[PDB]
Structures are given as structure tokens and as C-alpha cells.
């Protein structure tokens, strides 16, 4: 009776808060924390995961929405707008009776009709470079500046078309985003193979490695000593004075094992023996072995070594010795690059060059984070477009045609479910409206123009976010993902039903 | 509508106990502050100046009933 009204008000408030974010031309919000550090972002997922919401059921909506749509690429803010509009439209009929179950039946029937419509509208144009360009641009211009997105589209699309050779979509490890703080943010490219965070204390050991062999195996040039005896150095410090010694024999054992490894699998000072340590190493043994042609470094994280297993090769055990070099692999180039003060090791052209890392040079922390999120979103969107193989006309093209199909589907359903279907259509109509409003033009001017021209066009058609003119998104380059639409519709219907079925609230 | 029903119910309950030969007597103080004892329902109701319009309707219906039947 009134719990429904409370939920409606909370959902409308959340929708109104998230109104001015949809679309590339939409403005962006900024997040402030108690510490003082601020984040500047526009993506709905991070906004809902970071906002401090007052109303409880609004927090419910945000949490469940993020949880469900983590599976698909994005569309979070569009989903929130559609569910808010659904609730408002249902309220305009509930306020005069209209028991929520009938509205639920109408919603489910409209969902079925919209699913069939989307199935028969989806366009299966064969994949090429140009379509990937268009998808990357559409998915990137909605998270970062215009020209920055234009620069980043080429990098992301080239990386993704490189990845696509496996004929199966895989992600996470195979694409790595490195972060650094060069002033020139315009520098953004891709590096094949691996890029290591940093190296060790080596004065011009190998540099241009060219051909190399990778064994790693967490070398022990600074093998752990026996420092821990009882708490700390007590009056009985002879343990931490002498027992801490005699472990240099481990370091010399590793040195000699690498010695015959190098002059067994190489036979010359060339062909850099690439090894890594998970902790620091002593410069003495390090440069003594590097002067023999061994590429030894230190202080690397795990993710790089697991990537080395699949992209370079070689086992990795901290406690080890010389063993079968069968696991060892080869690298085309292990050249090291330094920008200003910190060293980057470019492990590229290696065996299985499928693994590729992405390079950005953001000036400060928040721009770096926004760039990382934008490139991740673009990668996910293009991967989904690869997987479905059938892109769909965006810019509100599918939504308006879906609304028209639902309206023409009104007499098909009996009972009072027609009211639910009509409300569902009017709610799905929100997306082009929000696009036009965020762009700056009048709401209903653009909406009426688009509907009127789509009446005779037959083909799908969107909105140009530069003049308000209707535009055929198919021929321009605006594209969305089939799976995104599927998951959005399904989750939207589910959450709308769940909220509408509530009757009363009590404490606990 | 429930307020009108409550008013009529209270008015009926006031004079219900006087029904039949075993009606309780009533202490009737008129406008001019005079003692008066009786059990007739018409006498007290004609003295009862109720305020709710539904009570007015029911009492005037009773008055019309007394007009041509003389009792009940």
C-alpha cells in the first residue's frame, strides 16, 4: 500500500541521480572519499559500487544490478533507467488498484515479445577490422575524452584482433594493462609477449638480448638466511651472528648451477639466460653471472611468472638446483627500456606470442584509473561482439523499434496484461530520451522526430548526438552487443517484478 | 462513511436499554435545568439534541414513524 510507494520513490531517486551519465556526450560525475582523494568517472558499474547510498532499497537495487550485469559487458546505467521508468509507469496504473500480478504478467509477455523482436532484428554482418573499429569507438567514447578515446581505439582494436587468432575468446592473463606515470599521456601502444615491472642492480649487463632462454625458477642469489631464532637479536646473538652465515653456500650453489646451465644450453656468452627472483638479489653474484651473459633480475610478482610459464616457459620453484632444461623456452627479444628513472624489461617476440600487454602513460592516478577502466570496457565489448558475431544498431535504434513492436503486439495478449505491455514499451522508450536530453536537445522534439521518421523508414534508426537529427546507426558505425541487450532485458524484468511484488515492510 | 455509522450506532445504543416493559429510567435535564425521570424513548430523543447529520436523518425518520403509527 505504502511500501510500494517508498520503493518507487527510492528507485526514481536513483534513476534521477544516474540520468546525466548515459551516452558519450553525457556529463561525468566525481567521487569524494573521507580521506580526501577523489575519483572522476562516468561508468555506471563503478558509480554504483562506489556511491554511498542513503535509502536501503536503493542500495539493494544497486547491489543486485551490479551483481547481475557483471556477467555481461556494460549497460548498467541504461538498466537502472529502464527499471526506474518501468516502476514509474507501473505506479501510474497501481495508484488506481491494478494488483501488481497483472502488471507482472504484462511485463513478462512484453519481455517475451521483445526477446523475439531482438532475435529477428540482430544483424550478423561478418567481422572485419572496420566493424571492430566502430565497436571500439562506441564502447570507448562513453568513458573518456573524445580524442583520447580515438587514440586508444586503434591500440585496443589491434590488440584484440591479435588475440582473436585462437578462435576462442579468452581474457584476463592474455591481455595485461601496465601502469606508469609519464607526463605525455598521448603515448599508448601495445607490446607483445610480456613486460616486467622492473629489474635489478646491473650496469649494462646485456641490454639488447636478442635470442634468449627463459628458466626463471626463482633464483636464490639472496637465499633466505636463518635470522629468525628467538624473536630478535638477544644477548645470545651468536645464533644471528654465525648461523646467519654459512648460507652463502646456497647462493654459490645457485651461481654454479646457472653457470653450467648457461654453458650447457648456450655454449657462448650470447643467448641471454633469462632468470628471475621473487625477492632481492646480491649485486655481486648478479653481475658476476650477468658478465657471463646471463639475464638475471629480481623482485617480480607472481602474475608475470605464471604468464612466463605459458608465454616463455620454464618451471619455478624457490628451492631448487640444476635440473632438466626441457621446461626452458626461447624469447625473440628481452630488451630493457628505461623512461627517466625506472626500468622496463620488454620480453617480446617470444614463443607463443599470443600473450600481449597494453601500454599507457597516464599523467596522474585518476586519469590512469579512468583510462584503465575505459580500455577494459572496450576490450570486453569488442570480445562480446566477437563472440555473438551479430552486432545490433545502437543509439536507441533497437529500443524504439522494440517499443513499436510491443505496441503493435498489444491486442495479442488478453486480460489486463496489455497495460503492463504498454508500460513496458513506454519504459524501454527511455533510452533515446536520455540520449537526447544528455546531448542537450529537447526531449520530445528528438523523440517525436525519431519515431516519425522510423514509422516509414522500416530500418532501424538512432539519434545523432551533434544536431538532434535522426540517424541510421547501422550505416554510421554505432553498435552494441547482443548479449548485453539479452542480459539487460532479462535482469530488468526480473528486478522490476521483484520490486513490484512487495507489499509491506517490517523491521528485523 | 464509518463516522456516520458510529454516530448512529451510539445514538441507538443510548436508547436501546429502554426497549420493552423493562426499560431503565432516564435522568432528563431539560434546557431550563429541571429534573425529569422517564423511560420513553421518544421523550429522551426529542430531548436529545444530537449533532451528527446521520443522527439527524435517523431521528427524523423515527419522528415520521411516530407521525402515523404513534409508537414503535
Amino acid at each position: 500500500q505504502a511500501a510500494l510507494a517508498v520503493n518507487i520513490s527510492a528507485a526514481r531517486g536513483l534513476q534521477d541521480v544516474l540520468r546525466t551519465n548515459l551516452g558519450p556526450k553525457g556529463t561525468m560525475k566525481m567521487l569524494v572519499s573521507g580521506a580526501g582523494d577523489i575519483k572522476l568517472t562516468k561508468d555506471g558499474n563503478v558509480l554504483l559500487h562506489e556511491m554511498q547510498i542513503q535509502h536501503p532499497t536503493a542500495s539493494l537495487i544497486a547491489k543486485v544490478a551490479t551483481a547481475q550485469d557483471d556477467i555481461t559487458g556494460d549497460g548498467t546505467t541504461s538498466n537502472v533507467l529502464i527499471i526506474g521508468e518501468l516502476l514509474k509507469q507501473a505506479d501510474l496504473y497501481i495508484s488506481e488498484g491494478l494488483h501488481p500480478r497483472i502488471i507482472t504478467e504484462g511485463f513478462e509477455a512484453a519481455k517475451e515479445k521483445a526477446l523475439q523482436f531482438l532475435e529477428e532484428v540482430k544483424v550478423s554482418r561478418e567481422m572485419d577490422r572496420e566493424t571492430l573499429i566502430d565497436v571500439a569507438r562506441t564502447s570507448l567514447r562513453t568513458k573518456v575524452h573524445a580524442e583520447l578515446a580515438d587514440v586508444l581505439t586503434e591500440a585496443v582494436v589491434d590488440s584484440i584482433l591479435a588475440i582473436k587468432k585462437q578462435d576462442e575468446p579468452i581474457d584476463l592473463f592474455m591481455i595485461e594493462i601496465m601502469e606508469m606515470k609519464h607526463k605525455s599521456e598521448t603515448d599508448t601502444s601495445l607490446i607483445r609477449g610480456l613486460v616486467l615491472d622492473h629489474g635489478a642492480r646491473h650496469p649494462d649487463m646485456k641490454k639488447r638480448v636478442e635470442d634468449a632462454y627463459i628458466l626463471t625458477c626463482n633464483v636464490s642469489l639472496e637465499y633466505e638466511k636463518t635470522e629468525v631464532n628467538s624473536g630478535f637479536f638477544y644477548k645470545s646473538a651468536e645464533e644471528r651472528e654465525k648461523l646467519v652465515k654459512a648460507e652463502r653456500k646456497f647462493i654459490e650453489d645457485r651461481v654454479k648451477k646457472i653457470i653450467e646451465l648457461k654453458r650447457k644450453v648456450c655454449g657462448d656468452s650470447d643467448k641471454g639466460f633469462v632468470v628471475i627472483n621473487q625477492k632481492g638479489i646480491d649485486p655481486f653474484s648478479l653481475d658476476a653471472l650477468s658478465k657471463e651473459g646471463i639475464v638475471a633480475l629480481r623482485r617480480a610478482k607472481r602474475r608475470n611468472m605464471e604468464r612466463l610459464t605459458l608465454a616463455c616457459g620454464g618451471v619455478a620453484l624457490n628451492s631448487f638446483d640444476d635440473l632438466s632444461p626441457d621446461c626452458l623456452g626461447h624469447a625473440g627479444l628481452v630488451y630493457e627500456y628505461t623512461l627517466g628513472e625506472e626500468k622496463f624489461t620488454f620480453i617480446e617476440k617470444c614463443n607463443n606470442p599470443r600473450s600481449v600487454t597494453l601500454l599507457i602513460k597516464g599523467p596522474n592516478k585518476h586519469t590512469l584509473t579512468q583510462i584503465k577502466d575505459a580500455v577494459r570496457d572496450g576490450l570486453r565489448a569488442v570480445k562480446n561482439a566477437i563472440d555473438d558475431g551479430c552486432v545490433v544498431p545502437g543509439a536507441g535504434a533497437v529500443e524504439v523499434a522494440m517499443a513499436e513492436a510491443l505496441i503493435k503486439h498489444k491486442p495479442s495478449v488478453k486480460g489486463r496484461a496489455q497495460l503492463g505491455v504498454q508500460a513496458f514499451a513506454d519504459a524501454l522508450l527511455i533510452i533515446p530520451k536520455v540520449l537526447a536530453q544528455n546531448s542537450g536537445f529537447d526531449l520530445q522534439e528528438t523523440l517525436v522526430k525519431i519515431q516519425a521518421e522510423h514509422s516509414e523508414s522500416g530500418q532501424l534508426v538512432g539519434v545523432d548526438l551533434n544536431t538532434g537529427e535522426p540517424m541510421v546507426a547501422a550505416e554510421v558505425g554505432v553498435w552494441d552487443n547482443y548479449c548485453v541487450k539479452k542480459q539487460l532485458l532479462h535482469s530488468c524484468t526480473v528486478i522490476a517484478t521483484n520490486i513490484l511484488l512487495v507489499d509491506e515492510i517490517m523491521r528485523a | 462513511v464509518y463516522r456516520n455509522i458510529q454516530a448512529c450506532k451510539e445514538l441507538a445504543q443510548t436508547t436501546r436499554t429502554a426497549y420493552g416493559p423493562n426499560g431503565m429510567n432516564k435522568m432528563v435535564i431539560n434546557h431550563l435545568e429541571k429534573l425529569f425521570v422517564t423511560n420513553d424513548a421518544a421523550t429522551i430523543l426529542r430531548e436529545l439534541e444530537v449533532q451528527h447529520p446521520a443522527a439527524k436523518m435517523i431521528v427524523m425518520a423515527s419522528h415520521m414513524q411516530e407521525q402515523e403509527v404513534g409508537d414503535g
Partner: protein, 477 residues
């Protein structure tokens, strides 16, 4: 004091009765719970909301406990009892106020329940046992409309074996049954279709070192809790002895000298089911030793490791009263529903053995019994007949809430149902729970177990008389 205490009790009863009166049926509304920290949970189950809600009135606590204890007794119907009790107390409102003592009300309610039992036993259409077609019809009637819509076959077969592997012919003809001796194994892994039934209990534990014999053609399992007992077991020489003590390698060879295979670190949850499956007797006192020390156990055993973990397979038991229903799948989010569904199916089989009947669902049984009482009341006399009619009238609460949480107007539908039902002689017309329209239940294929209906009505009447018997609550605050 006076009437005020009973009024407070029954008002607290009505509040928690109608807090969830909408929560039953195939179109149940979903309730809204928030704790005072911002945590939010969306619930559609009456037991869960009644558990999480906090109330202080003793009458409300008593009825919540009544519902909770009735939950394990029968399973389904855990909310209809609360609704019925609340409606009966709400109609007893009007008789408590007109100054009649609760004793006559209790007498009238007991007479009404006595008529209830007979009327239910009359109109219930008979149903046979273990026949596949109407058994699956029952499965659709009760188990479905939940998250096992696309996996009903596994629940069906598990229930079909379960109703046959817990048979107890103790004091009659299989009328005794239990729901806790079934060796259920809910192990995640693989497709959900990996579930299967195996005759006889099986144990998640086995010997640490399998350099030894476990399976023998005549497993004489003996329960047991120092080698003196080990070589005193030789009194009959059972092949396998189940105990709860650790066994060493030298102790294991001592067992081999004793022709026994003991086990270690096994809980009573396995031991009792082993005893039920094998039908043995436990004895350890030296003076208690006699010819009855050892009872023959199962008929076979097997050594097998399923899912990279060591199990004990007691297959082909002497008594098929504690068998194994293996269950493998993705996770447990589907199998709790399977457990409650198999419990319901075992109750259905048990009552069909007791009273092979299925009362019509969708309020048809409620309408039939209400019509029976409202026509029988016309003949009998006494001031006690007012509660007798009141309970029958208030029993109409199930169809009204069914129609209410469907969209359709309850009043017109209820009037059409009753007016049709009176002229109808033996029709038992009900209401569709999904569309809110009148339909004969035999056509719609919806039915309800007789035992659960009897339990619900009897428990509701008993709760009503219990809450109307209380004359004061003051013993402190």
C-alpha cells in the same frame, strides 16, 4: 484483566496471522525485511519471515513455535495453519465481546473439528500407490512451481526409490516410515544427473590403509565402542565389526587374527544408519555376552573410491530400510528443494498407505467442508451453534487469500464459488491459483495429501482452543 487479556492475546495472534496472509499460493507476494543496519533481504517464504521477525507478546511467540514445530511434522501447509488460526480467533472476537464464557466456545470448536475430520475423510477422492501416472501428477501438483521445473525427473526417481527404501513393518503393514534413515549423499561435482540410488547405507569413511579385506559375502556387522575385547569377539567371529577407536598396524593385524575389520573416527550419524541398515545389536559388557551378541548384518560389501575420496559401500543390505540415495551436481542450491520434495513425497506415500486419498486443492476441499458444516449446523441446536457456524465461515480464508494474491476480486469469485458449490452435489469445484478463475480440480489436476490436511485442521483448532483457554498472562512484566 477480564476480557482484556484474551483480547490482547487474540489481537497479537491476528497481527502475525495476517502479516503473511498473502504469502501462500503459486502467486505469492514477496515480503520486505530490513535489519537496523541497512542490510536488505527479499523473502517469499512464511517460515523465514516468521523466524526473522521479532515479537514480544507471549501468544504470538506460542503460535510461531506451533508453526515451527508443525513445519518438521508435515512440511507443507506451514502457513495455512497460521492463517486458519488467526481467522478463527478473529471471528471469535465477536463472541468474546458478547459475554459468553470461553468454555462453550471450546466445546463448539471441538465439535466442529470432530465434524471436520469426518467430512474430510468423506469427500477425499481415493488415490492408489506407486502407480507412475498420478504419482507424477502429484509431483506436478506439489513439487513443481519451484526451481526444479527443468529437473523434475531426478526428484521423481529419488522420491520413488525413497518411498520404498524406508519401509517399516514394525507393528502393522508398512504404515511406519521415517525420513532420517535415508543415506543421502549431497556431494557437489559433475552434472546434476549423476545422482543415483544404491540399496544399503554407505559411509564416507573407510580404512586409512586399504591393504586389507573389506568385502565379504556375508557381512555380519557388529556395533562396538586393549585387545581383550578384540579376542573376546571370537565368541561368534563376525567378519566385520564397526567401532569408534583408532586402529594401529599391529592392531590391524590383531583384527585380522580376530577375523574383524574395525573402523575409526566414525560419528554416530553413520553408526545409527549402519545399525538400521544391517539390523545388528551392540554389546560390550563381558557379563552381557550371550548367543544374541552378534546379529547378521548386510548381504554384501564393496570397496570403491568415487570422486577421489575413500568411501565404504554397504550394498545389498539384509533390511532395505536404510539405503543410499547418491546426489551429485553443481552445488546445493537445487538439492535442498530436492530434500524437502522427497520428504513431502515420502509423507504422501505414507499417508496413502494410511489413507489412500487426495483432497481437492485450490480451496475446493475448504468449500466442501464449509458447506458440510453450514448445512449440518441448521439441524443441531443450542447457543453453541454460533461458533460452530463461525469456524466454518472463517475457514473460507484460504480461497479468499488465493484470489486476493491473484488480481481477481475475492468477493465476486467467492460468491460464485460458494453459490455454485452448494447446488453442486459432489463436484468440489475450486479456483485456479495462477489465473484466479473457477475450475474443477479433477480437470486442473491439483490435489493435496490427506494427512497434512488433517494435521493442519487439527493443529489450527487446537491452537485456537489453547489461545482461548488462557485466562491471564501476568506473572511479572
Amino acid at each position: 484483566s477480564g476480557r482484556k487479556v484474551q483480547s490482547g492475546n487474540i489481537n497479537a495472534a491476528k497481527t502475525i496471522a495476517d502479516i503473511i496472509r498473502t504469502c501462500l499460493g503459486p502467486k505469492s507476494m514477496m515480503k520486505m525485511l530490513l535489519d537496523p543496519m541497512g542490510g536488505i533481504v527479499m523473502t517469499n517464504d512464511g517460515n523465514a519471515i516468521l523466524r526473522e521477525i521479532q515479537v514480544q507478546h507471549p501468544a504470538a511467540k506460542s503460535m510461531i513455535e506451533i508453526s515451527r514445530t508443525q513445519d518438521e511434522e508435515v512440511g507443507d501447509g506451514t502457513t495455512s495453519v497460521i492463517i486458519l488460526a488467526g481467522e478463527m480467533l478473529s471471528v471469535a472476537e465477536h463472541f468474546l465481546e458478547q459475554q459468553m464464557h470461553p468454555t462453550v466456545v471450546i466445546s463448539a470448536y471441538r465439535k466442529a473439528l470432530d465434524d471436520m475430520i469426518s467430512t474430510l475423510k468423506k469427500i477425499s477422492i481415493p488415490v492408489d500407490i506407486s502407480d507412475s501416472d498420478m504419482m507424477l501428477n502429484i509431483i506436478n501438483s506439489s513439487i513443481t512451481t519451484k526451481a526444479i521445473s527443468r529437473w523434475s525427473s531426478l526428484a521423481c526417481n529419488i522420491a520413488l526409490d525413497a518411498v520404498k527404501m524406508v519401509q517399516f513393518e514394525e507393528n502393522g503393514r508398512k504404515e511406519i516410515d521415517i525420513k532420517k534413515y535415508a543415506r543421502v549423499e549431497k556431494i557437489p561435482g559433475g552434472i546434476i544427473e549423476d545422482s543415483c540410488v544404491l540399496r544399503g547405507v554407505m559411509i564416507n569413511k573407510d580404512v586409512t590403509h586399504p591393504r586389507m579385506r573389506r568385502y565379504i559375502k556375508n557381512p555380519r556387522i557388529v556395533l562396538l565402542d586393549i585387545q581383550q575385547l578384540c579376542e573376546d569377539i571370537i565368541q561368534l567371529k563376525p567378519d566385520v565389526v564397526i567401532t569408534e577407536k583408532g586402529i594401529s598396524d599391529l592392531a590391524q593385524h590383531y583384527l585380522m587374527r580376530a577375523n574383524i575389520t574395525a573402523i575409526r573416527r566414525v560419528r554416530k550419524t553413520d553408526n545409527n544408519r549402519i545399525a538400521r541398515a544391517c539390523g545388528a545389536r551392540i554389546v560390550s559388557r563381558p557379563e552381557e555376552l550371550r548367543e544374541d551378541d552378534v546379529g547378521t548384518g548386510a548381504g554384501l560389501l564393496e570397496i570403491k573410491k568415487i570422486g577421489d575420496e575413500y568411501f565404504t559401500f554397504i550394498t545389498d543390505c539384509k533390511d532395505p530400510k536404510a539405503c543410499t540415495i547418491l546426489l551429485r551436481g553443481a552445488s546445493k542450491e537445487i538439492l535442498s528443494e530436492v530434500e524437502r520434495n522427497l520428504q513431502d513425497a515420502m509423507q504422501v506415500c505414507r499417508n496413502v498407505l494410511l489413507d489412500p486419498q487426495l483432497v481437492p486443492g485450490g480451496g475446493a476441499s475448504e468449500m466442501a467442508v464449509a458447506h458440510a458444516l453450514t448445512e449440518k449446523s441448521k439441524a443441531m441446536t443450542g447457543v453453541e451453534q454460533w461458533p460452530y457456524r463461525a469456524v466454518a465461515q472463517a475457514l473460507e480464508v484460504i480461497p479468499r487469500t488465493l484470489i486476493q494474491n491473484c488480481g481477481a476480486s475475492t468477493i465476486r469469485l467467492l460468491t460464485s464459488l460458494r453459490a455454485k458449490h452448494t447446488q453442486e452435489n459432489c463436484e468440489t469445484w475450486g479456483v485456479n491459483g495462477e489465473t484466479g478463475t473457477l475450475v474443477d480440480m479433477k480437470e486442473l489436476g491439483i490435489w493435496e495429501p490427506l494427512a497434512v490436511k488433517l494435521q493442519t485442521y487439527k493443529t489450527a483448532v487446537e491452537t485456537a482452543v489453547l489461545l482461548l483457554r488462557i485466562d491471564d498472562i501476568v506473572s511479572g512484566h
